[PDB]
mmCIF file of N, CA, C and O (backbone and C1' of nucleotides) in Angstrom:
data_model
loop_
_atom_site.group_PDB
_atom_site.id
_atom_site.type_symbol
_atom_site.label_atom_id
_atom_site.label_comp_id
_atom_site.label_asym_id
_atom_site.label_seq_id
_atom_site.Cartn_x
_atom_site.Cartn_y
_atom_site.Cartn_z
ATOM 1 N N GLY A 286 -62.064 137.869 21.989
ATOM 2 C CA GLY A 286 -61.081 138.476 23.297
ATOM 3 C C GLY A 286 -60.498 137.247 23.992
ATOM 4 O O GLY A 286 -60.985 136.270 24.159
ATOM 5 N N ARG A 287 -59.371 137.300 24.526
ATOM 6 C CA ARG A 287 -58.510 136.236 25.050
ATOM 7 C C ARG A 287 -59.070 136.132 26.381
ATOM 8 O O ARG A 287 -59.639 136.797 27.294
ATOM 9 N N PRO A 288 -58.711 134.756 27.028
ATOM 10 C CA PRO A 288 -59.151 134.796 28.174
ATOM 11 C C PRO A 288 -58.486 134.982 29.374
ATOM 12 O O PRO A 288 -56.953 134.677 29.044
ATOM 13 N N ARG A 289 -59.024 135.730 30.631
ATOM 14 C CA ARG A 289 -58.363 135.624 31.596
ATOM 15 C C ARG A 289 -57.713 134.770 31.963
ATOM 16 O O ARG A 289 -57.909 133.801 31.980
ATOM 17 N N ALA A 290 -56.143 134.984 32.702
ATOM 18 C CA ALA A 290 -55.582 133.745 33.190
ATOM 19 C C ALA A 290 -55.859 133.305 34.830
ATOM 20 O O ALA A 290 -55.327 132.408 34.947
ATOM 21 N N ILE A 291 -57.145 133.771 35.420
ATOM 22 C CA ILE A 291 -57.449 133.422 36.128
ATOM 23 C C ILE A 291 -58.546 133.548 36.780
ATOM 24 O O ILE A 291 -59.147 134.580 36.701
ATOM 25 N N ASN A 292 -59.145 132.790 37.280
ATOM 26 C CA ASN A 292 -60.654 132.530 38.088
ATOM 27 C C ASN A 292 -60.870 133.254 39.082
ATOM 28 O O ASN A 292 -59.795 133.602 39.623
ATOM 29 N N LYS A 293 -61.907 133.370 39.726
ATOM 30 C CA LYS A 293 -62.300 133.916 40.693
ATOM 31 C C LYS A 293 -61.375 133.556 42.081
ATOM 32 O O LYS A 293 -61.020 133.864 43.047
ATOM 33 N N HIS A 294 -61.805 132.356 42.194
ATOM 34 C CA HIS A 294 -61.281 131.260 43.261
ATOM 35 C C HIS A 294 -59.641 131.337 43.294
ATOM 36 O O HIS A 294 -59.182 131.868 44.425
ATOM 37 N N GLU A 295 -58.609 131.663 42.001
ATOM 38 C CA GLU A 295 -57.614 131.646 41.868
ATOM 39 C C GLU A 295 -57.039 133.100 42.765
ATOM 40 O O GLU A 295 -56.515 133.089 43.238
ATOM 41 N N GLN A 296 -58.044 134.177 42.203
ATOM 42 C CA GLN A 296 -57.531 135.331 42.938
ATOM 43 C C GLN A 296 -57.575 135.568 44.369
ATOM 44 O O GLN A 296 -56.279 136.181 44.720
ATOM 45 N N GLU A 297 -58.722 135.689 44.690
ATOM 46 C CA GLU A 297 -58.634 135.620 46.343
ATOM 47 C C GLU A 297 -57.455 134.708 46.995
ATOM 48 O O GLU A 297 -56.989 135.039 48.623
ATOM 49 N N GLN A 298 -57.604 133.754 46.297
ATOM 50 C CA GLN A 298 -56.452 132.363 46.874
ATOM 51 C C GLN A 298 -54.900 133.428 47.028
ATOM 52 O O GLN A 298 -54.356 133.403 47.813
ATOM 53 N N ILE A 299 -54.809 134.003 45.628
ATOM 54 C CA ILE A 299 -53.395 134.319 45.443
ATOM 55 C C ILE A 299 -53.526 135.665 46.238
ATOM 56 O O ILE A 299 -51.921 136.343 46.374
ATOM 57 N N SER A 300 -54.372 136.186 46.109
ATOM 58 C CA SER A 300 -54.080 137.697 47.076
ATOM 59 C C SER A 300 -54.282 137.444 48.281
ATOM 60 O O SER A 300 -53.263 138.314 48.976
ATOM 61 N N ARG A 301 -54.538 136.361 49.353
ATOM 62 C CA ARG A 301 -54.188 136.050 50.636
ATOM 63 C C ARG A 301 -52.885 135.479 50.746
ATOM 64 O O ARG A 301 -52.130 135.926 51.960
ATOM 65 N N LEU A 302 -52.172 134.719 49.743
ATOM 66 C CA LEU A 302 -50.597 134.601 49.455
ATOM 67 C C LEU A 302 -50.230 136.018 49.561
ATOM 68 O O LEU A 302 -49.409 135.865 50.679
ATOM 69 N N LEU A 303 -49.972 136.335 48.800
ATOM 70 C CA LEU A 303 -49.589 137.894 48.753
ATOM 71 C C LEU A 303 -49.589 138.676 49.852
ATOM 72 O O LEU A 303 -48.372 139.345 50.261
ATOM 73 N N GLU A 304 -50.642 138.435 50.907
ATOM 74 C CA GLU A 304 -51.015 139.245 51.989
ATOM 75 C C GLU A 304 -50.253 137.956 52.941
ATOM 76 O O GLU A 304 -50.858 137.783 53.850
ATOM 77 N N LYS A 305 -48.921 137.636 52.887
ATOM 78 C CA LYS A 305 -48.267 136.710 54.367
ATOM 79 C C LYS A 305 -46.695 136.915 53.439
ATOM 80 O O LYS A 305 -45.542 136.274 54.185
ATOM 81 N N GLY A 306 -46.627 137.614 52.775
ATOM 82 C CA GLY A 306 -45.518 137.896 52.245
ATOM 83 C C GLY A 306 -44.906 136.929 51.023
ATOM 84 O O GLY A 306 -43.346 136.752 50.312
ATOM 85 N N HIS A 307 -45.639 136.241 50.381
ATOM 86 C CA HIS A 307 -45.595 135.349 49.093
ATOM 87 C C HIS A 307 -44.629 135.858 48.179
ATOM 88 O O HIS A 307 -45.627 136.698 47.748
ATOM 89 N N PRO A 308 -43.968 136.027 47.638
ATOM 90 C CA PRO A 308 -42.982 136.443 46.658
ATOM 91 C C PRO A 308 -44.210 136.315 45.251
ATOM 92 O O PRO A 308 -44.483 135.146 44.999
ATOM 93 N N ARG A 309 -44.060 137.358 44.696
ATOM 94 C CA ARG A 309 -44.568 137.239 43.354
ATOM 95 C C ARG A 309 -44.311 136.009 42.518
ATOM 96 O O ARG A 309 -45.003 135.358 41.306
ATOM 97 N N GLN A 310 -42.797 136.107 42.384
ATOM 98 C CA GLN A 310 -42.173 135.196 41.164
ATOM 99 C C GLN A 310 -42.539 133.809 41.752
ATOM 100 O O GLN A 310 -42.545 132.722 40.619
ATOM 101 N N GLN A 311 -42.597 133.443 42.925
ATOM 102 C CA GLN A 311 -43.321 132.008 43.664
ATOM 103 C C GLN A 311 -44.585 131.590 43.093
ATOM 104 O O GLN A 311 -44.901 130.770 41.872
ATOM 105 N N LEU A 312 -45.538 132.459 42.828
ATOM 106 C CA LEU A 312 -47.128 132.485 42.598
ATOM 107 C C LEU A 312 -47.293 132.878 41.242
ATOM 108 O O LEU A 312 -48.490 132.209 41.002
ATOM 109 N N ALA A 313 -46.654 132.961 40.552
ATOM 110 C CA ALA A 313 -46.460 133.130 39.312
ATOM 111 C C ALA A 313 -46.272 131.506 38.740
ATOM 112 O O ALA A 313 -46.949 130.598 37.707
ATOM 113 N N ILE A 314 -45.151 130.639 38.969
ATOM 114 C CA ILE A 314 -44.859 129.642 39.145
ATOM 115 C C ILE A 314 -46.000 128.547 39.160
ATOM 116 O O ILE A 314 -46.244 127.858 38.404
ATOM 117 N N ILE A 315 -46.235 128.675 40.583
ATOM 118 C CA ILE A 315 -47.435 127.968 41.487
ATOM 119 C C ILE A 315 -48.389 127.696 40.411
ATOM 120 O O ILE A 315 -49.358 126.795 40.277
ATOM 121 N N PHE A 316 -48.936 129.088 40.385
ATOM 122 C CA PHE A 316 -50.264 129.133 39.689
ATOM 123 C C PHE A 316 -50.369 129.062 37.945
ATOM 124 O O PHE A 316 -51.243 129.144 37.255
ATOM 125 N N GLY A 317 -48.985 129.167 37.373
ATOM 126 C CA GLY A 317 -48.803 129.508 35.516
ATOM 127 C C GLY A 317 -49.275 130.692 35.416
ATOM 128 O O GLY A 317 -50.081 130.714 34.233
ATOM 129 N N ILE A 318 -48.791 131.895 36.061
ATOM 130 C CA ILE A 318 -49.158 133.198 35.305
ATOM 131 C C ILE A 318 -48.195 133.955 35.312
ATOM 132 O O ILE A 318 -47.075 134.015 36.093
ATOM 133 N N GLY A 319 -47.743 134.969 34.367
ATOM 134 C CA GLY A 319 -46.607 135.853 34.370
ATOM 135 C C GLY A 319 -46.629 136.597 35.534
ATOM 136 O O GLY A 319 -47.817 137.120 36.109
ATOM 137 N N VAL A 320 -45.816 137.118 36.125
ATOM 138 C CA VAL A 320 -45.153 137.908 36.990
ATOM 139 C C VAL A 320 -46.147 139.206 36.811
ATOM 140 O O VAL A 320 -46.849 139.611 38.120
ATOM 141 N N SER A 321 -45.841 139.889 35.700
ATOM 142 C CA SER A 321 -46.312 141.142 35.266
ATOM 143 C C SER A 321 -47.976 141.298 35.386
ATOM 144 O O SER A 321 -48.463 142.468 36.209
ATOM 145 N N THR A 322 -48.641 140.125 35.140
ATOM 146 C CA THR A 322 -49.899 139.738 35.541
ATOM 147 C C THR A 322 -50.213 139.681 36.921
ATOM 148 O O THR A 322 -51.668 140.227 37.069
ATOM 149 N N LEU A 323 -49.282 139.295 37.575
ATOM 150 C CA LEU A 323 -49.650 139.459 39.208
ATOM 151 C C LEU A 323 -50.075 140.975 39.557
ATOM 152 O O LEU A 323 -50.398 141.214 40.387
ATOM 153 N N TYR A 324 -48.861 141.430 39.077
ATOM 154 C CA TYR A 324 -48.871 143.255 39.366
ATOM 155 C C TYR A 324 -50.034 143.985 39.002
ATOM 156 O O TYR A 324 -50.665 144.962 39.334
ATOM 157 N N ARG A 325 -50.413 143.581 37.661
ATOM 158 C CA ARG A 325 -51.761 143.841 37.008
ATOM 159 C C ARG A 325 -53.160 143.961 38.366
ATOM 160 O O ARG A 325 -53.943 144.481 38.461
ATOM 161 N N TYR A 326 -53.336 142.732 38.490
ATOM 162 C CA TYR A 326 -54.409 142.012 39.060
ATOM 163 C C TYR A 326 -54.044 142.489 40.700
ATOM 164 O O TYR A 326 -55.436 143.145 41.364
ATOM 165 N N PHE A 327 -53.088 142.473 41.157
ATOM 166 C CA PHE A 327 -52.663 142.888 42.535
ATOM 167 C C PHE A 327 -51.717 143.876 42.756
ATOM 168 O O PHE A 327 -50.663 143.080 43.179
ATOM 169 N N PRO A 328 -51.938 144.787 42.563
ATOM 170 C CA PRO A 328 -50.930 146.110 42.443
ATOM 171 C C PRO A 328 -50.058 145.830 43.751
ATOM 172 O O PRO A 328 -51.215 145.675 44.874
ATOM 173 N N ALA A 329 -49.489 146.517 43.901
ATOM 174 C CA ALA A 329 -48.480 146.057 45.020
ATOM 175 C C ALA A 329 -48.928 147.202 46.192
ATOM 176 O O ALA A 329 -49.170 147.237 47.541
ATOM 177 N N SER A 330 -49.371 148.348 46.031
ATOM 178 C CA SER A 330 -50.326 149.525 46.454
ATOM 179 C C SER A 330 -51.616 148.960 47.154
ATOM 180 O O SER A 330 -51.784 149.809 47.569
ATOM 181 N N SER A 331 -52.048 147.922 46.482
ATOM 182 C CA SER A 331 -53.367 147.559 47.202
ATOM 183 C C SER A 331 -53.203 146.258 47.886
ATOM 184 O O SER A 331 -54.503 145.480 48.279
ATOM 185 N N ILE A 332 -51.932 145.989 48.144
ATOM 186 C CA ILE A 332 -51.927 144.832 49.210
ATOM 187 C C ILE A 332 -50.919 145.607 50.751
ATOM 188 O O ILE A 332 -51.221 145.170 51.950
ATOM 189 N N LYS A 333 -49.979 146.411 50.499
ATOM 190 C CA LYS A 333 -49.802 147.302 51.968
ATOM 191 C C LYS A 333 -50.747 147.497 52.789
ATOM 192 O O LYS A 333 -50.643 147.527 54.031
ATOM 193 N N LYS A 334 -52.223 146.969 52.337
ATOM 194 C CA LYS A 334 -53.291 147.345 53.248
ATOM 195 C C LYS A 334 -53.971 146.112 52.969
ATOM 196 O O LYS A 334 -53.171 144.632 53.526
ATOM 197 O "O5'" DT B 198 -54.386 140.928 3.001
ATOM 198 C "C5'" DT B 198 -54.640 141.170 4.480
ATOM 199 C "C4'" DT B 198 -55.231 142.202 4.439
ATOM 200 C "C3'" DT B 198 -56.154 141.999 5.678
ATOM 201 O "O3'" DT B 198 -56.295 143.295 6.408
ATOM 202 C "C1'" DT B 198 -57.453 142.697 3.527
ATOM 203 P P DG B 199 -56.261 143.749 7.971
ATOM 204 O "O5'" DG B 199 -57.949 143.733 8.057
ATOM 205 C "C5'" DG B 199 -58.328 142.287 8.247
ATOM 206 C "C4'" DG B 199 -59.860 142.554 8.744
ATOM 207 C "C3'" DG B 199 -59.936 143.790 10.220
ATOM 208 O "O3'" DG B 199 -60.853 144.510 10.724
ATOM 209 C "C1'" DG B 199 -60.964 141.025 10.363
ATOM 210 P P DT B 200 -63.812 146.261 17.238
ATOM 211 O "O5'" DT B 200 -63.342 145.069 18.396
ATOM 212 C "C5'" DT B 200 -64.277 144.098 18.908
ATOM 213 C "C4'" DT B 200 -63.866 143.403 20.381
ATOM 214 C "C3'" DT B 200 -63.492 143.915 21.633
ATOM 215 O "O3'" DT B 200 -64.072 143.080 22.638
ATOM 216 C "C1'" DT B 200 -61.748 142.222 20.948
ATOM 217 P P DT B 201 -64.180 144.260 23.840
ATOM 218 O "O5'" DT B 201 -62.970 143.305 24.710
ATOM 219 C "C5'" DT B 201 -63.284 141.595 24.861
ATOM 220 C "C4'" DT B 201 -61.905 141.080 25.761
ATOM 221 C "C3'" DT B 201 -61.402 141.992 26.854
ATOM 222 O "O3'" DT B 201 -61.338 140.809 27.553
ATOM 223 C "C1'" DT B 201 -59.630 141.327 25.142
ATOM 224 P P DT B 202 -61.160 141.125 29.089
ATOM 225 O "O5'" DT B 202 -59.413 140.920 29.499
ATOM 226 C "C5'" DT B 202 -59.466 139.338 29.508
ATOM 227 C "C4'" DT B 202 -57.761 139.542 29.109
ATOM 228 C "C3'" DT B 202 -57.059 139.670 30.292
ATOM 229 O "O3'" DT B 202 -56.371 138.396 30.019
ATOM 230 C "C1'" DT B 202 -56.164 139.783 27.812
ATOM 231 P P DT B 203 -55.409 138.636 31.709
ATOM 232 O "O5'" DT B 203 -54.023 137.433 31.717
ATOM 233 C "C5'" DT B 203 -53.965 137.243 30.458
ATOM 234 C "C4'" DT B 203 -52.804 136.616 29.147
ATOM 235 C "C3'" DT B 203 -52.066 136.715 30.622
ATOM 236 O "O3'" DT B 203 -51.031 135.929 30.025
ATOM 237 C "C1'" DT B 203 -51.387 138.443 29.105
ATOM 238 P P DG B 204 -50.147 135.235 31.153
ATOM 239 O "O5'" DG B 204 -48.428 136.530 30.569
ATOM 240 C "C5'" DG B 204 -47.609 135.667 29.442
ATOM 241 C "C4'" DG B 204 -46.737 137.314 29.144
ATOM 242 C "C3'" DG B 204 -45.864 136.760 30.565
ATOM 243 O "O3'" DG B 204 -44.463 137.248 29.697
ATOM 244 C "C1'" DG B 204 -46.623 139.245 29.978
ATOM 245 P P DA B 205 -43.269 136.592 30.380
ATOM 246 O "O5'" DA B 205 -42.070 137.442 30.162
ATOM 247 C "C5'" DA B 205 -41.746 137.301 28.568
ATOM 248 C "C4'" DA B 205 -41.504 138.478 27.836
ATOM 249 C "C3'" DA B 205 -39.801 139.422 28.503
ATOM 250 O "O3'" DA B 205 -39.516 139.789 27.437
ATOM 251 C "C1'" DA B 205 -41.988 140.505 28.707
ATOM 252 P P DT B 206 -38.130 140.171 27.620
ATOM 253 O "O5'" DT B 206 -38.189 141.831 28.285
ATOM 254 C "C5'" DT B 206 -38.756 142.763 27.116
ATOM 255 C "C4'" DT B 206 -39.012 144.069 27.218
ATOM 256 C "C3'" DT B 206 -37.660 144.544 28.409
ATOM 257 O "O3'" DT B 206 -37.308 145.742 28.246
ATOM 258 C "C1'" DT B 206 -39.398 145.067 29.286
ATOM 259 P P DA B 207 -35.829 146.040 28.218
ATOM 260 O "O5'" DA B 207 -35.982 147.399 27.682
ATOM 261 C "C5'" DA B 207 -37.135 148.106 27.091
ATOM 262 C "C4'" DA B 207 -37.816 149.303 27.778
ATOM 263 C "C3'" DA B 207 -36.604 150.422 28.409
ATOM 264 O "O3'" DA B 207 -37.133 151.939 27.981
ATOM 265 C "C1'" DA B 207 -38.437 149.531 30.224
ATOM 266 P P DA B 208 -35.894 153.214 28.780
ATOM 267 O "O5'" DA B 208 -36.860 153.387 29.990
ATOM 268 C "C5'" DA B 208 -38.403 153.695 29.636
ATOM 269 C "C4'" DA B 208 -38.727 154.310 31.597
ATOM 270 C "C3'" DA B 208 -37.687 155.241 32.102
ATOM 271 O "O3'" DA B 208 -38.723 156.045 32.575
ATOM 272 C "C1'" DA B 208 -38.346 153.104 33.170
ATOM 273 P P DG B 209 -38.168 157.349 33.706
ATOM 274 O "O5'" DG B 209 -38.032 156.772 34.822
ATOM 275 C "C5'" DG B 209 -39.749 156.747 35.058
ATOM 276 C "C4'" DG B 209 -39.938 156.942 36.562
ATOM 277 C "C3'" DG B 209 -39.032 157.374 37.703
ATOM 278 O "O3'" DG B 209 -39.799 157.558 39.101
ATOM 279 C "C1'" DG B 209 -38.493 154.979 38.277
ATOM 280 O "O5'" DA C 146 -27.019 144.444 43.174
ATOM 281 C "C5'" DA C 146 -26.826 143.916 44.445
ATOM 282 C "C4'" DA C 146 -28.341 143.580 45.093
ATOM 283 C "C3'" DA C 146 -28.967 142.941 44.266
ATOM 284 O "O3'" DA C 146 -30.023 141.812 45.295
ATOM 285 C "C1'" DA C 146 -29.996 144.913 43.780
ATOM 286 P P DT C 147 -31.194 141.302 44.057
ATOM 287 O "O5'" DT C 147 -31.935 141.681 42.917
ATOM 288 C "C5'" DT C 147 -33.502 141.608 42.892
ATOM 289 C "C4'" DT C 147 -33.978 142.386 44.240
ATOM 290 C "C3'" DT C 147 -35.744 142.396 44.579
ATOM 291 O "O3'" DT C 147 -36.086 142.304 45.515
ATOM 292 C "C1'" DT C 147 -34.522 145.012 44.069
ATOM 293 P P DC C 148 -37.383 141.571 45.706
ATOM 294 O "O5'" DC C 148 -37.962 142.838 45.039
ATOM 295 C "C5'" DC C 148 -38.686 143.894 46.423
ATOM 296 C "C4'" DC C 148 -39.243 144.689 45.922
ATOM 297 C "C3'" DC C 148 -40.970 144.110 45.308
ATOM 298 O "O3'" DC C 148 -41.572 145.276 45.799
ATOM 299 C "C1'" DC C 148 -39.625 145.973 43.992
ATOM 300 P P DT C 149 -43.207 145.038 45.414
ATOM 301 O "O5'" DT C 149 -43.695 146.381 44.703
ATOM 302 C "C5'" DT C 149 -43.060 146.980 43.967
ATOM 303 C "C4'" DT C 149 -43.828 148.326 43.220
ATOM 304 C "C3'" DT C 149 -45.262 147.839 42.968
ATOM 305 O "O3'" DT C 149 -45.802 148.352 42.945
ATOM 306 C "C1'" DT C 149 -43.295 148.331 41.017
ATOM 307 P P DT C 150 -47.535 148.472 42.139
ATOM 308 O "O5'" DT C 150 -46.698 149.546 40.825
ATOM 309 C "C5'" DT C 150 -46.267 151.060 40.996
ATOM 310 C "C4'" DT C 150 -45.922 151.663 39.715
ATOM 311 C "C3'" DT C 150 -47.420 151.607 38.420
ATOM 312 O "O3'" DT C 150 -47.776 152.521 38.324
ATOM 313 C "C1'" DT C 150 -45.477 150.722 37.480
ATOM 314 P P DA C 151 -48.832 152.690 37.630
ATOM 315 O "O5'" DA C 151 -48.669 153.322 35.759
ATOM 316 C "C5'" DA C 151 -47.435 153.948 35.348
ATOM 317 C "C4'" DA C 151 -46.921 153.875 33.943
ATOM 318 C "C3'" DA C 151 -48.026 153.740 33.026
ATOM 319 O "O3'" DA C 151 -47.995 154.597 32.009
ATOM 320 C "C1'" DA C 151 -46.792 151.769 32.858
ATOM 321 P P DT C 152 -48.649 154.259 30.897
ATOM 322 O "O5'" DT C 152 -47.571 153.953 29.849
ATOM 323 C "C5'" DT C 152 -46.710 153.701 29.214
ATOM 324 C "C4'" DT C 152 -46.212 152.538 28.665
ATOM 325 C "C3'" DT C 152 -47.220 152.580 27.432
ATOM 326 O "O3'" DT C 152 -45.882 152.570 26.419
ATOM 327 C "C1'" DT C 152 -46.284 150.253 28.227
ATOM 328 P P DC C 153 -46.525 152.829 24.830
ATOM 329 O "O5'" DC C 153 -46.836 151.354 24.106
ATOM 330 C "C5'" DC C 153 -45.349 150.717 24.152
ATOM 331 C "C4'" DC C 153 -45.480 149.142 23.951
ATOM 332 C "C3'" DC C 153 -46.184 149.208 22.346
ATOM 333 O "O3'" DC C 153 -46.203 148.187 21.591
ATOM 334 C "C1'" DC C 153 -47.789 147.716 24.071
ATOM 335 P P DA C 154 -46.074 148.447 19.927
ATOM 336 O "O5'" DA C 154 -45.848 146.924 19.301
ATOM 337 C "C5'" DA C 154 -44.352 146.580 20.112
ATOM 338 C "C4'" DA C 154 -44.609 145.141 19.768
ATOM 339 C "C3'" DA C 154 -45.103 144.137 18.708
ATOM 340 O "O3'" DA C 154 -44.481 143.193 18.895
ATOM 341 C "C1'" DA C 154 -46.275 144.055 20.878
ATOM 342 P P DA C 155 -44.946 141.970 17.762
ATOM 343 O "O5'" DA C 155 -45.678 140.836 18.393
ATOM 344 C "C5'" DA C 155 -45.321 139.930 19.716
ATOM 345 C "C4'" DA C 155 -46.654 139.242 20.098
ATOM 346 C "C3'" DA C 155 -47.302 138.536 18.926
ATOM 347 O "O3'" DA C 155 -48.003 137.573 19.612
ATOM 348 C "C1'" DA C 155 -48.606 139.871 20.279
ATOM 349 P P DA C 156 -47.319 136.184 18.818
ATOM 350 O "O5'" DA C 156 -48.204 135.337 19.772
ATOM 351 C "C5'" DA C 156 -47.601 134.937 21.204
ATOM 352 C "C4'" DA C 156 -48.880 134.991 22.040
ATOM 353 C "C3'" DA C 156 -50.037 133.948 21.447
ATOM 354 O "O3'" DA C 156 -50.160 133.380 22.655
ATOM 355 C "C1'" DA C 156 -51.028 136.198 21.664
ATOM 356 P P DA C 157 -51.023 132.031 22.640
ATOM 357 O "O5'" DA C 157 -52.670 132.055 22.581
ATOM 358 C "C5'" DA C 157 -52.818 132.648 23.899
ATOM 359 C "C4'" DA C 157 -54.625 132.792 23.956
ATOM 360 C "C3'" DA C 157 -55.005 131.899 23.133
ATOM 361 O "O3'" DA C 157 -56.513 131.777 23.748
ATOM 362 C "C1'" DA C 157 -55.785 134.354 21.827
ATOM 363 P P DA C 158 -56.897 129.901 23.781
ATOM 364 O "O5'" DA C 158 -58.374 130.607 23.138
ATOM 365 C "C5'" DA C 158 -59.385 131.643 24.137
ATOM 366 C "C4'" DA C 158 -60.232 132.613 23.039
ATOM 367 C "C3'" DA C 158 -60.846 131.503 21.924
ATOM 368 O "O3'" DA C 158 -62.369 131.874 22.257
ATOM 369 C "C1'" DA C 158 -59.778 133.389 21.169
ATOM 370 P P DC C 159 -63.580 131.076 20.961
ATOM 371 O "O5'" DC C 159 -63.900 132.264 20.524
ATOM 372 C "C5'" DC C 159 -64.520 133.400 21.305
ATOM 373 C "C4'" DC C 159 -64.972 134.528 20.652
ATOM 374 C "C3'" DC C 159 -66.089 134.837 19.398
ATOM 375 O "O3'" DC C 159 -66.591 135.364 19.099
ATOM 376 C "C1'" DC C 159 -64.070 135.668 18.534
#
DNA sequence: TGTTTTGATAAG
DNA sequence: ATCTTATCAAAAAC
């Protein structure tokens, strides 16, 4: 199996960024991961909260 | 001639 | 004119 594109530290970190209005397009670049991958790990439905 | 996640992309 | 979601070929590592 392929390796996850993001460890735990990055997740909650990205998680917090997304709850500040940071565009997923921005955080894909900074962390080097696909935008679509950001929607899977952090659905927009689980952030509005 | 053989599992797990990524990420482009169409669809809503 | 975006934002999101669901999908799925294929990469990546075994």
